[PDB]
A = this chain, B = another copy of it.
């Protein structure tokens, strides 16, 4: 699709870039020492201040499919988001929050989604006091090398599942895929109730093996 712009550089962006290999990514940062790592990761480097409108334009934010924002502090991240919104009101903005208390301000500035790595981290650590299964779960289903992965499968128009409940769909027994959620618009229902009825456009959030995932895609396709 369209290129992705990343504003700022942290240790998050390095791991982000690694997963986005094969997509057109522009990294806008003012730290020149980072240029070589950016190129090594397969991305393009654009030197400038992401809180400056003219530099966001240089990165072609107005033609991006999304902008990911993670500057050194939350106030700078907010400043950058405000600059993006002056240029492009509709472009999807994903931002990293440093502090929990600032999340609402990141949204208010214009972020469509906020990710708080240190909230996630602190919560996983406190939950790892006796055993690490919850932390193992989160880190395994996000890793590519895992046999069992977390995927999103959209329910197409004319799907065999349209109008069918979670209970009657019997997705785990039929396909081997665990439904952990169904999402639509900006809403996510985790562990949907048996009487939730699938709609075309619903996104199924599932966990399964690659062959289980294919069985799921076939099961929910339109009749032939």
Contact present for A12 and B203 (CB under 8 Å): no
Chain A interface main SS type: mixed
Interface residues on A, range: 35 or more
Extra contacts, 20 of them, besides A115-B139, A136-B183, A178-B179 (Cβ < 8 A), are: A12-B118, A15-B126, A16-B123, A16-B125, A19-B126, A68-B128, A92-B130, A94-B132, A117-B124, A119-B139, A120-B121, A120-B142, A123-B142, A131-B152, A131-B183, A134-B150, A136-B188, A137-B190, A178-B191, A190-B207
Contact present for B19 and A140 (CB under 8 Å): no
Q: Which residue of B lies closest to A146 (CB)?
A: B190
Provide the residues of chain B in CB contact with A200, threshold 8 Å.
none
Provide the residues of chain B in CB contact with A179, threshold 8 Å.
178
